[PDB]
Design a protein around this ligand. Structure first.
Ligand SMILES: Nc1nc2ncc(COP(=O)(O)OP(=O)(O)O)nc2c(=O)[nH]1
Ligand SMILES: Nc1nc2ncc(COP(=O)(O)OP(=O)(O)O)nc2c(=O)[nH]1
Ligand SMILES: Cc1cc(NS(=O)(=O)c2ccc(N)cc2)no1
Ligand SMILES: [Mg+2]
Ligand SMILES: [Mg+2]
Lengths: 275, 274
C-alpha cells in the first residue's frame, strides 16, 4: 500500500528514490554546491526530472566530527528552501533535522516528512514532531556525530538495532505519533565500522518484522569509499550497487545523491522482483 | 569454486568479471570500435587495468539478425596470440567454428565460449582435442529467428533440460564435467518477461554444481526498460550484474569492466559479511 502526508501518497510496493538536497557549506560529499536558493531549486528540479519522489532537505552536516549549527542558521538554510519547493512542485519534502524549531517551521512551510538521524531525542523535538502530525523517520546511531566512529562495537548488531527501534517506536507512540506514521533507518555509517555496515546490508530484510517502511542511506559513504579507495564523487557505482542490494531485500526508500543512476537501477530491480 | 587451465587458476568463491573484446564491424553496441589489431590490444589492457580477470574475444556478432571461416579466423587468432604473449590472464574465445576453436587454443586461449554449445559440425570434437574448459550457452532457435515470438511453457525447465542434454553430450565426448560452465543466454530467444524471470530465478541453476557465466551487458532487456541507447546502459547493466552475483553467479561478461568490478567489490563485501 501507501505512506501518506497531507493528501500525498507514496507507493511502498516499489522502491522510491529520495534525492539529497544539502543546504550547508560542509556536507561530506557536496558542501557548498547547493548553498543559495536558486541553485538549490535547480538541483531539486534536476532530481525530480531524474525520477526522485522525495527531496530531503538538510542544513546540518552530521558526518563524523561535524560542527554544531545554530538554531537560527539551520532555519535560514532550510525553511526558505522548503517554502520555495512546496510552492513549485508536487513531491514529498523531507527535512533532515533534529531541532524542534526546524521541525515546526518546516511543517509550517509545507514539509511532509521529518527525517531525524537523532530519533527526536533533542529537547522539544518529540513534542514538536507529534504536533505536526507528519510521518517521522527514526535512525539507529551509536554515539553522537562527534564520537560515533571512535571504536564502534556490538555484541550483536541486529539485536541492538531491533532494541533501539523498539524503544523509540514506543516513545513516539506514547507521545501520540501513530505507529503507521513511522519509518525506520538502520543508519549506515553512524557508529558502525566497515564490517558492521556490510553485516547490516547483508541482513537488512530482517528489519521488515516491525512492519514499517525502511529508509536507507548509503550514498557515497565511507562504506563504499573504503572498498574502492576513491573520492566521494567517484562512488556512484558502488553506491548504486548498495542501493540494488538494499532494494532487492525490499527497502522501500533509498536516500541518494545520484538520483538518475539510482532510478535506472531501481527499474531493473522492480522488473526482477515483479517476475 | 576453483577453476584451473594452463596452470592459471581462477577463483570462483568471488565474482569474476569477463571483459568483452569484439573484433567485428557489426556488434550491437561496439561494432567497428576495436577492429584493427592495435585497438584490440589497447582495449584489452584497459579492461585488465580495470580489473578484468578474463578477456573474451569474439569475431562473430550473434545479435538478432553470417561470417566466413577465413574471415572469422583472421579476426581472432592474431589477437589471441598477442594477448597470450603479453598478459597473464584467462583468454576466452567467443566462437562456434571448429577451425576457430582449434587455432585459438594453439595461440594460447584458456576457455571456449560457445553460444551454440558446440553444435556446429566438428566443434564438439575440436573442443575435446584441446582439453580446455567450455562454456555452454542456452538459446532458443538461431540468431536469425530467435526473437520471433520466443515461447516457453516453463522457461527454467527448458534451460535445465537443455543443459542436462549438453553436459552428457560433452562428457560422452571426453570432456570432464568439472571443465564445464553454464550460461542461460540472456536475450537469446527470450522476450522481456523471459529475461527477468530468468534473472529472478537464476540461483536455481546452481543445482548442476557448475560455474555460472551470465551476459546481460547493454542488452535489450535493459534498453527496453530504460529507453536509452546501448552505450548509456551501463547503470542498468551493473544493476543486472549485482542481482546475478548476489545469487552466486561466478562470471559476469561485460563491456564496462571498471564499473562492474567496483560493483562486484560491494557484492563480495556483502556476501562475505554473511
Ligand atoms: N535518514 C537518514 N538521514 C541521513 N542524513 C544525512 C546522511 C549523511 O549524508 P549527507 O547528507 O550527504 O552527509 P552530511 O551529514 O555531511 O550532510 N545520512 C543519512 C542516512 O543514512 N539516513
Ligand atoms: N556466453 C555468452 N556469450 C555471449 N557472447 C556474445 C553476446 C552478445 O554480446 P556482444 O558480443 O557484445 O554482441 P554481439 O553478438 O553483437 O557481438 N552475449 C553472450 C552471452 O550472454 N553469453
Ligand atoms: C535489435 C536487437 C535486439 C537485441 N537483443 S540483445 O539482448 O540486445 C542481444 C544482443 C546481442 C546478442 N548476441 C544477443 C541479444 N540485440 O539487437
Ligand atoms: Mg546532509
Ligand atoms: Mg560479440
Amino acid at each position: 500500500m501507501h505512506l501518506t502526508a497531507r493528501g500525498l501518497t507514496l507507493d511502498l510496493s516499489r522502491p522510491q528514490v529520495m534525492g539529497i538536497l544539502n543546504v550547508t557549506p560542509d556536507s561530506f560529499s557536496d558542501g557548498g554546491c547547493h548553498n543559495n536558493l536558486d541553485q538549490a531549486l535547480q538541483h531539486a528540479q534536476r532530481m525530480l526530472s531524474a525520477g526522485a519522489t522525495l527531496i530531503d532537505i538538510g542544513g546540518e552536516s552530521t558526518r563524523p566530527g561535524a560542527a554544531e549549527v545554530s538554531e537560527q542558521e539551520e532555519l535560514d538554510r532550510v525553511v526558505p528552501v522548503v517554502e520555495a519547493l512546496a510552492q513549485r512542485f508536487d513531491v514529498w519534502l523531507s527535512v533532515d533535522t533534529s531541532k524542534a524549531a526546524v521541525i515546526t517551521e518546516s511543517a509550517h512551510a509545507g514539509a511532509h516528512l521529518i527525517n531525524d538521524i537523532r530519533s527526536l531525542q533533542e529537547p522539544g523535538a518529540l513534542e514538536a514532531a507529534a504536533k505536526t502530525g507528519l510521518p517521522v523517520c527514526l535512525m539507529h546511531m551509536q554515539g553522537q556525530p562527534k564520537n560515533m566512529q571512535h571504536s564502534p562495537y556490538y555484541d550483536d548488531l541486529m539485536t541492538d538495532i531491533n532494541r533501539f527501534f523498539q524503544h523509540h517506536i514506543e516513545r513516539c507512540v506514547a507521545a501520540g505519533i501513530a505507529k503507521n506514521k513511522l519509518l525506520l533507518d538502520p543508519g549506515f555509517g553512524f557508529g558502525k565500522n566497515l564490517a558492521h555496515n556490510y553485516q547490516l546490508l547483508a541482513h537488512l530484510s530482517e528489519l521488515h518484522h516491525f512492519e514499517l517502511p525502511l529508509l536507507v542511506g548509503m550514498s557515497r559513504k565511507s562504506m563504499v569509499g573504503q572498498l574502492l579507495n576513491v573520492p566521494p564523487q567517484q562512488r556512484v557505482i558502488g553506491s548504486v550497487a548498495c542501493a540494488v542490494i538494499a532494494a532487492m531485500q525490499g527497502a522501500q526508500i533509498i536516500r541518494v545523491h545520484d538520483v538518475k543512476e539510482t532510478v535506472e537501477a531501481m527499474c531493473i530491480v522492480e522488473a526482477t522482483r515483479s517476475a
